[PDB]
Design a binder for these strands. Structure first.
Ligand SMILES: [Mg+2]
Ligand SMILES: [Mg+2]
Ligand SMILES: [Mg+2]
Length: 801
RNA sequence: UUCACAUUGCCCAAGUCUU
RNA sequence: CAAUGUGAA
């Protein structure tokens, strides 16, 4: 229940494609390096301060110690040759514009053993060694630039990218050290993010309150203005030599604001001989909230290098997108340009440790897998062939289409804007498209009424449920973004158990065959239909025995949030196609990735699978979304055992083989076409089906990249798959092809999607639960748990489509 | 709330210390 | 999923 399996073989399927990856080969010497433990007292210091302390310690004590160490900013220091130490501590007193630094040797780190691990020689990769190289590579940029996660950012020389509101775009790069089948690799990607401009607070005020200049006006701020400014500046650092965090903005102007030693303006007159230019403006309160330290706006600058953590406005987001959007070839050139300019090999710390980094992207060969054929129904039973990741439903009918006999319309958009003529026309066109699709809407709705406001939803839906026997669907027209949507889903999904399909008013007023067709995809599925199936004879051999496919995700609350639950969702296939899925969902501890109640959720799905198919799965294939490498073992330990537990508690001796695959869409690996002639479309991305399981992948374990989707814009993220457990002993070919075919089973569109349908559905399930919780997030836990519990009649449905 | 792709928001990471 | 773009039968 622990060690991941070795790669069983390499994949052979599909034509070859020449690729370049944003991995840069590293040459590492075969020598021991020395690891020391550092303690700095006081140790409440920010990581950057600690680095300065060690920096000054190193320069001050050069003679008879140190005469180029690297440091992680906490407790770990490395040198390329040993120090005058033994395991002897040395207490050191460092001074800087009052610290004591203790140094204990701990161990040798042999880079020779790392070479062995990269070979077949040694069973696993020693983390401590990778960690040491990482500290070496991060040492200089950690002090030269602003670290954010595994990235580094700086203001770009010669350019300004203002966002307004005192904010601007900074450009940067991600950096990480990775082992691979070939060599150690430096993974480098470009990025951008919002930072606050290092500008005078006066200017910051003008940008926030939308003044062209101060002096408009010389009257004190309205509380409306004062409140808006306070919200933007609270928690930011300002500088006077002297740095402070702002905790509030005073109510009174500097001319009238007092403290006991006296007005603020007068104190600065007497003590600092400064006559304030704008006495009418409030002061910044800084330092301890319970003290009385106030600074006039005029003597303060926003300090450089503070990342914006708050959400960007809509206009700011727009500007950000326009500033940073790039086609794949543009992104590739930007990474390449960055590497030539970065010049890692003249970093004196990199050089101290004898490391060389290649200035060119690694060449790797991919294979482009063949897509499955897609089987439709009706009389014709059309077969669709995906091309460049896309097909469509023209002249095709659903494998199993629902006949819609009883349905209703509830229009929450105002009658003046969404007229009865609009509704009739929308209905006419929908019935036409639905008939073509093999989902005939046999007549007019049984009910069609306007309503206004969230209060009208539950009584209208109760009336519909009680009045219309056999009601299959309520189509709900919405004026745009509205609290009514969350109310419709609360009532439909959780209170009454009724199928609902919402449509925005703009898509009723003006219809297109493409939008209506996509809408029908969702309606058929919600009503129990099977849109299409993989061509049965084209599926991998795993389908010769009963198998269930699970998709699992946890979604965490937004940045800055302190009390919202994380939401766990698990879905499971319910037929042999596989097409139909059922869902389970839970609320759990804030920011916990491990799925706490997984055993109960899997039990539920196994029971429903048997009820639906009358088979007990002989295999369980578990696609687990979003777990990072540093959490593989913790997550596997709990979740693999939970799956086993669900089986054991059900029966026997019931021991189906489990394959546990982590899917990661958000990592920093990018792949590009080497040959211009392979670039697909305006965005110039690799083609759907591109698979990589060599060179840049893990030296011993079973992992691969599969970019399953067509890239429409920007640079495609190739999904990564890591097999953490495999009782079923898949070949690489079989598992890669299986995974690709599952990306073609997603019901909401006639496209190959970027992750397998079960994983994608798990996201939709988690996001629906988040909707069920809007403004609601032991006694606490039970309340949230009730909110996300669907109605009995919804339990077995694809309500999340 | 037609849908996918893309950027950000999500576990690990990162961050947090005289008026 | 939300904000913002690129797109589609
Ligand atoms: Mg997740
Ligand atoms: Mg942490
Ligand atoms: Mg959107």
């Amino acid at each position: 229940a622990f060690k991941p399996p070795p790669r069983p073989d390499f994949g052979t399927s599909g034509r070859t494609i020449k690729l370049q990856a944003n991995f840069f080969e590293m040459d590492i010497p075969k020598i021991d390096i020395y690891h020391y433990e550092l303690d700095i007292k006081p140790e409440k210091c920010p990581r950057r301060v600690n680095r300065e302390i060690v920096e000054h310690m190193v320069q001050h004590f050069k003679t008879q110690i140190f005469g180029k160490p690297v440091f992680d900013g906490r407790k770990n220091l490395y040198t390329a040759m040993p120090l005058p130490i033994g395991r002897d501590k040395v207490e050191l007193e460092v001074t800087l514009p009052i610290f004591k630094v203790s140094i204990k040797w701990v161990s040798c780190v042999s880079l020779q053993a790392l070479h062995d691990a990269l070979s077949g020689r040694l069973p696993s990769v020693p983390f401590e060694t990778i960690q040491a190289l990482d500290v070496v590579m991060r040492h200089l940029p950690s002090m030269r630039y602003t670290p954010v996660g595994r990235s580094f950012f700086t203001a770009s020389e010669g350019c300004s990218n203002p966002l307004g509101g005192g904010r601007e775009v900074w450009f940067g790069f991600h950096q990480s050290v990775r082992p691979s089948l070939w060599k150690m690799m430096l993974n480098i990607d470009v990025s951008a993010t919002a930072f606050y401009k290092a500008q005078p607070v006066i200017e910051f005020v003008c940008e926030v309150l939308d003044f062209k200049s101060i002096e408009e006006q010389q009257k004190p701020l309205t509380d409306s203005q004062r409140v808006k400014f306070t919200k933007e500046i609270k928690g930011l650092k300002v500088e006077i030599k002297r740095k402070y965090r702002v905790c509030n903005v005073t109510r009174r102007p500097a001319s009238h604001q007092t403290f006991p030693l006296c007005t603020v303006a007068q104190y600065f007159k007497d003590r600092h001989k400064l006559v304030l230019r704008y006495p009418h403006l409030p002061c910044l309160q800084v330092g301890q909230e319970q003290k009385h330290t106030y600074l006039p706006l005029e003597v303060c600058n926003i300090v450089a290098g503070q990342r914006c953590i708050k959400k960007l406005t809509d206009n700011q987001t727009s500007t950000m997108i326009r500033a940073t959007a790039r086609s794949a070839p543009d992104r590739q050139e930007e990474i390449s340009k960055l590497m030539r300019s970065a010049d890692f090999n003249t970093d004196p710390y990199v050089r101290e440790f004898g490391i060389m980094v290649k200035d060119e992207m690694t060449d790797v060969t991919g294979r482009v897998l063949q897509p499955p054929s897609i089987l439709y129904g009706g009389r014709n039973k059309a077969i669709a062939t995906p091309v460049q990741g896309v097909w469509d439903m023209r002249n095709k009918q659903f494998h199993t289409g629902i006949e819609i006999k009883v349905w209703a319309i509830a229009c929450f958009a105002p009658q003046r804007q969404c007229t009865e003529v609009h509704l009739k026309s929308f209905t006419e066109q929908l019935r036409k498209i639905s008939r073509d699709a093999g989902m005939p809407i046999q007549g007019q709705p049984c009910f069609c009424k306007y309503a206004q406001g969230a209060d009208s939803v539950e009584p209208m839906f109760r009336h519909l449920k009680n009045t219309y026997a056999g009601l299959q669907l309520v189509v709900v027209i919405l004026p745009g973004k509205t609290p009514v949507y969350a109310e419709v889903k609360r009532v439909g999904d959780t209170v009454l158990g009724m199928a609902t399909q919402c449509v925005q008013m703009k898509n009723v007023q003006r219809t297109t065959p493409q939008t209506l067709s996509n809408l029908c995809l969702k309606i058929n599925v919600k009503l129990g239909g099977v849109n299409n199936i993989l061509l049965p004879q084209g599926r991998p051999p795993v389908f010769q025995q009963p198998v269930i496919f699970l998709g699992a995700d946890v979604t965490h609350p937004p940045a800055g949030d302190g009390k919202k639950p994380s939401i766990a969702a698990v879905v499971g296939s319910m037929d042999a196609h596989p097409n139909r899925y059922c869902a389970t969902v839970r609320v759990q501890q804030h920011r916990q990735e491990i799925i706490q109640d997984l055993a109960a959720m899997v039990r539920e799905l196994l029971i429903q699978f048997y009820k639906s198919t009358r088979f007990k799965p002989t295999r369980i294939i578990f696609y687990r979304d979003g777990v990072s490498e540093g959490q593989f073992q913790q997550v596997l330990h709990h979740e693999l055992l939970a799956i086993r537990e669900a089986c054991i508690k059900l029966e026997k001796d019931y021991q189906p083989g489990i394959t546990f695959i982590v899917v990661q869409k958000r990592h920093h690996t990018r792949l590009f076409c080497t040959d211009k002639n392979e670039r697909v479309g305006k965005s110039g991305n690799i083609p759907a089906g591109t698979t990589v399981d060599t060179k840049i992948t893990h030296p011993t374990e079973f992992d691969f990249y599969l970019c399953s989707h067509a890239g429409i814009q920007g640079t495609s993220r190739p999904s990564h798959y890591h097999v953490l457990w495999d009782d079923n002993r898949f070949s690489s070919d079989e598992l890669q092809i299986l995974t690709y075919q599952l990306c073609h089973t997603y019901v909401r569109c006639t496209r190959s999607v970027s992750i397998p349908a079960p994983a994608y559905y798990a996201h939709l399930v988690a996001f629906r639960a988040r909707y069920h919780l809007v403004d609601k997030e032991g006694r606490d836990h039970q309340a949230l748990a009730k909110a996300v519990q669907v109605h009995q009649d919804t339990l077995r449905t694809m309500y999340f489509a």
